[model samples]
Target: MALLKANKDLISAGLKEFSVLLNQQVFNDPLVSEEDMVTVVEDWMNFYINYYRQQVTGEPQERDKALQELRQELNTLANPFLAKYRDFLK
Candidate 1:
């Protein structure tokens, strides 16, 4: 189960990057107001962290399913930004 630590470490790194990307002022959208974006990012981050924690008490099958859904959710959320802000994110 030492590998589990690596899994969490990777998740934490990804989560930090995602949080920074969302929180950056440069990536703020014109059509999507910052207020709404902030709230969404905040909620998403909360769910993202806790969702992984569920693995301790939840089924791996269910976690994997929800994890896939959450991955899609994040991709959809970040796609628009990345499309135009590719250079900005880096």
Candidate 2:
């Protein structure tokens, strides 16, 4: 989760970085209405973390290309300032 939080009009460095990359638009579009944008984004974060956790532990782990592709999509959508690293993400 973004330790520091905010809505679309207001946002933190952590969430902002992820948002621009993922949504490309809609900074606050119906975002954080009930919960918060941070929480919404965290759902995705939690999934990815859990996926990574599975990758490094326990019985035989599954390697799903489609899911990894999704992660790549999320990752590469990141801020353009990190454009150079986007290739690595791909």
Candidate 3:
């Protein structure tokens, strides 16, 4: 859900390779720091707003029973995940 950047000088003394960890996959456990959560969430929010604004704006809806039917179907397909957020472990 959140991510932060890595520093070139920061290396793992615990690991033999002495490399820094990075977020390669999506979700990625918990957003450990405020900066990380802010960075990732902010990025997604920006993209989401622009994408949806572009999409639904052009596609005007009619005020009728068919519109309601389509809305219900869309809601069914867009529920749960559309309203929820999550993070994952590597």
Candidate 4:
């Protein structure tokens, strides 16, 4: 019943819902396509999943570093798209 353990199912469901939303948004918006958005989402999901697994299993520092790099990569890809989408809302 720890934060990570208790929230596992919720986290999975939320990620799945976000994936669907990303795809739907891409289909509705011309600025980005479904394929591109899906790739971005998948990368982000992988980064977080790896990070979470590391935390749950007490992975080594090197593993954490690698996952951190992946998270940074995801941030780099997502930030621009998010900014553009935010501008669209304004």
Clashing pairs in 2: 21-77, 21-78
List RMSD in Å for every model shown. 10.2, 15.5, 17.7, 10.5
Residues 1-90 of candidate 1 have per-residue lDDT tens digits of 223453445455555677576666564455665456557755766676575756543357644544444454466656665555555443
Candidate 3 accuracy as lDDT: 0.32
TM-score of each: 0.36, 0.30, 0.28, 0.37
Off by over 4 Å in 4: 1-24, 27-47, 50-59
Of candidates 4 and 2, the better by lDDT? 4
lDDT of 4: 0.53
lDDT of 3 at 90: 21
lDDT by residue (1-90, candidate 4, tens digit) is: 233443344345444544565565552346655457558766766866665664543336644544444444445556655766666643
After superposition, which runs of candidate 2 have C-alpha atoms over 4 Å from their true positions?
Answer: 1-35, 57-90
lDDT of each: 0.56, 0.40, 0.32, 0.53
Best first by TM-score, ranked: 4, 1, 2, 3
Select the stronger candidate by TM-score from 1 and 3. 1
Worst-scoring 10-residue span by lDDT in model 2: 2-11
78, model 2: CA deviation in Å? 9.7
Collision pairs in model 4: none
